Design a protein around this ligand. Sequence first.
Ligand SMILES: Nc1ncnc2c1ncn2[C@@H]1O[C@H](CSCC[C@H](N)C(=O)O)[C@@H](O)[C@H]1O
Ligand SMILES: Nc1ncnc2c1ncn2[C@@H]1O[C@H](CSCC[C@H](N)C(=O)O)[C@@H](O)[C@H]1O
Ligand SMILES: C[N+](C)(C)CCOP(=O)(O)O
Ligand SMILES: C[N+](C)(C)CCOP(=O)(O)O
Length: 485
Amino acid sequence: EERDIQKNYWIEHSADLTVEAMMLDSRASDLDKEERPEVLSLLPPYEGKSVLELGAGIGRFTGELAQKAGELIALDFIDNVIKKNESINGHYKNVKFMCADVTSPDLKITDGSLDLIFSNWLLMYLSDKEVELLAERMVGWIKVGGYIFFRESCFHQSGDSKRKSNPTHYREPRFYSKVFQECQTRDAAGNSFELSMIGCKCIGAYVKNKKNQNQICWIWQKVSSENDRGFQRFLDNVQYKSSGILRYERVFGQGFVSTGGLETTKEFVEKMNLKPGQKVLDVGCGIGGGDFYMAEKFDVHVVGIDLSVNMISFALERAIGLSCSVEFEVADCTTKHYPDNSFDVIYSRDTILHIQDKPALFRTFFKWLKPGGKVLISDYCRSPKTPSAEFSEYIKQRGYDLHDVQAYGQMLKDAGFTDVIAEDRTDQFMQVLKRELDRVEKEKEKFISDFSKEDYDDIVGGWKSKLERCASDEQKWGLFIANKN
Ligand SMILES: Nc1ncnc2c1ncn2[C@@H]1O[C@H](CSCC[C@H](N)C(=O)O)[C@@H](O)[C@H]1O
Ligand SMILES: Nc1ncnc2c1ncn2[C@@H]1O[C@H](CSCC[C@H](N)C(=O)O)[C@@H](O)[C@H]1O
Ligand SMILES: C[N+](C)(C)CCOP(=O)(O)O
Ligand SMILES: C[N+](C)(C)CCOP(=O)(O)O
């Protein structure tokens, strides 16, 4: 049924075979004039390379692409439309034209043959499943080092034209970020590949003309993928499933997934003495609230990494249109490489409990920090006492690696850091837990409506259990600060 309703929409809106008919907007001409060159300027390098254009239409871009590309395939599922394209651009000897549906089980494209797959409005005309299947196909079609560009209306309809029916999917940007980042291929020799997100941004011509930032494009590059992705999947499927992230955010505060939300962030960031132009690495950046805060308040550049595809998908969505200097990447902090002496500050909030080999991580932090730089970490810890049975079960289910506060400080000293401060902030942690829990209980009706009774009970139960384990001299919270001399 999806194929029928989507094709019928394009049969109707292709009948006139004009740019205006495609644009579905009263200011089609001016939008085209301003946005066409912008899209072209955003494409990754493809001169002399092999390009596939999906949903080419009557050919707004096809002619331009043909002038640069070594080889071009222009594809559309409306035969009349691709015929019109060919009537105009067929004189380019390097262009092949196809009438095909990108979702077809019979569509044949040779794996590892393409340098760029380009579309501009396409995935919004596919079902969720169709997008997932096509994304995986696309990763196979491009060579390692090749690129994918796509652009969609997100959130809601952009154009002002009257439409009797409309099957378009207006998605949140995080859907596209997640689906493409989740793709994985493996060749017959056993080598694994995935995409790296090169850029994601809104189209300026539409911000200027339509006063909204819903026209969003993505650029991805196919790269070698050497790490097993099992732990990433555990994060995205269990503790940090999207609903888990959103319910945690409700408790902790907008933009945060850890202790105290903005309040603790303001307190800890102050200790950094951030100066304009400095560069901060945020290890475990989550949904980005602390990064936006540092960048906006202090005029620093923040490099944020997080292993969770869900987390980064949220962060990239929330970063759209912002003037502050932040970049986000899906990466494992235990395998990621940076040059020595890259960062003024390394910052991490309640993330390193997920890391099993902290000494190895801290030795890397020592290298990555500039001389004179600072490391600031908050993290879950334990008493030097042996954990109770209940505390041990919590630790096991979460997969946490917990140490006592003194020992954690010692690991920083052993990694080479100077003037290590290791503060037991468990009393503050308990005060924060109570405030967070009291707010949830007070706003119970709104919480259950937005989430569920189960979600509410999970959060209330989890916070009460933390209060108990903290009161009982078991679970701890530490703040650690040190310098590289
Ligand atoms: N499943 C599908 N397979 C192939 N083409 C499709 C398709 N779904 C939509 N299309 C085509 O995608 C185009 C979207 S309109 C944009 C056309 C062009 N990318 C440009 O920006 O000018 C339409 O021409 C439509 O017919
Ligand atoms: N090996 C690893 N590399 C990078 N991030 C990791 C990681 N292991 C766990 N994480 C991330 O650690 C984060 C903890 S949640 C806290 C996020 C943010 N610092 C905030 O305070 O709001 C999760 O988003 C999780 O995906
Ligand atoms: C221009 N276009 C019609 C192909 C894409 C935008 O669609 P819409 O957001 O107006 O529904
Ligand atoms: C660890 N965290 C603060 C990032 C998220 C919450 O974990 P938990 O307190 O539910 O175990």
